């Protein structure tokens, strides 16, 4: 036995020496040296200093550049807002708590920081799915005589919020729960304890199938059809050097988007699957945060891939950052 249970938490450290304390009441310097909490605070500072400007500037240039306010760009703005939910609802709170050594805001603040951190990551998750669906519908033209408009773009954003609420609200009402994870400074969905009072097992399964398998299949199918459509069109039009460049660029971006999506959620998939299955084991609190590293950093590199590598957005941002001329 290598954990300590409480009414609303689970510290991954044995209490056979009597030093384990509540993560809501006292610093947790027995599961990690104080400098590791400082490095945890240092990494939260990095995500804030990089994640906020790049994501805020995306909303700013859209206000300034009329050509960016198109329906196909709504879901990109929804991506920037979701990243900001991760920055302020999660990153800033964790920077604060890590400087204390424990989660100072108690169980109520744990549900708050856990709801908005899960909501932010899920909106960004499903925004990448909706973006693939729209790009597949627009380019592959799978429906007969259909034009993507403003009402379809709004429903695409509303669909992400509904999927995120269908993913962060259940822990607040008794399906799974929010508890401090790893070094006990940030809160998330419980998959380290089989808390039968809230049915953690059926939620983790519903979490894995509906909110990871379904998104992964949809993204692979849509972008798979897109690369097929583009390569087919260019093959039937090899006299156009521009169409040959487009086929290469589109293929290169699809590989980058799919690989980045895997780097984001696959470590969180397997490592949390192992912690869930091989439960009650001697999970290092440092080992807990290995999947959280790749997923949380997506608040920084999703804007780089989906905004900064977009020609229309990058030109408007260079103009705005360079005082108005470039």
């Amino acid at each position: 036995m290598n954990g300590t249970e409480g009414p609303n938490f689970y510290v991954p450290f044995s209490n056979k020496t009597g030093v384990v304390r509540s993560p809501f009441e006292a610093p947790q310097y027995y599961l990690a040296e104080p400098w590791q909490f400082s490095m945890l605070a240092a990494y939260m500072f990095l995500l804030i200093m990089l994640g906020f400007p790049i994501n805020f500037l995306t909303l700013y240039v859209t206000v300034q550049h009329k050509k960016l306010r198109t329906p196909l760009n709504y879901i990109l703005l929804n991506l920037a807002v979701a990243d900001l939910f991760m920055v302020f609802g999660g990153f800033t709170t964790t920077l604060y708590t890590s400087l204390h050594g424990y989660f100072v805001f108690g169980p109520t603040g744990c549900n708050l920081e856990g709801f908005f951190a899960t909501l932010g990551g899920e909106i960004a998750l499903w925004s990448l799915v909706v973006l693939a669906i729209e790009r597949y519908v627009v380019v592959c033209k799978p429906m007969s005589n259909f034009r993507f408009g403003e009402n379809h773009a709004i429903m695409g954003v509303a669909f992400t919020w509904v999927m995120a609420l269908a993913c962060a609200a259940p822990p607040l009402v008794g399906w799974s729960r929010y508890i401090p994870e790893g070094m006990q400074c940030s809160c998330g969905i419980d998959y380290y304890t089989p808390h039968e009072e809230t049915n953690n097992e059926s939620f983790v399964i519903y979490m894995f199938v509906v909110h990871f398998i379904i998104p992964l299949i949809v993204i692979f199918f849509c972008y798979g059809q897109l690369v097929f459509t583009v390569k087919e069109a260019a093959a039937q039009q090899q006299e156009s050097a521009t169409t040959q460049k487009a086929e290469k660029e589109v293929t290169r971006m699809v590989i980058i988007m799919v690989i980045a999506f895997l780097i984001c959620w696959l470590p969180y998939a397997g490592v949390a699957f192992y912690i869930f299955t091989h439960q009650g084991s001697d999970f290092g609190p440092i080992f807990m945060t290995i999947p959280a590293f790749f997923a949380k950093t997506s608040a920084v590199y999703n804007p780089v891939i989906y905004i900064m590598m977009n020609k229309q957005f990058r030109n408007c941002m260079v103009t705005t950052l360079c005082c108005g001329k470039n």
Partner: peptide, 11 residues
């Protein structure tokens, strides 16, 4: 497809 690839920000 060149026009639709620009609309979705892929080219």
């Amino acid at each position: 497809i060149l026009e639709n690839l620009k609309d979705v920000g892929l080219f």
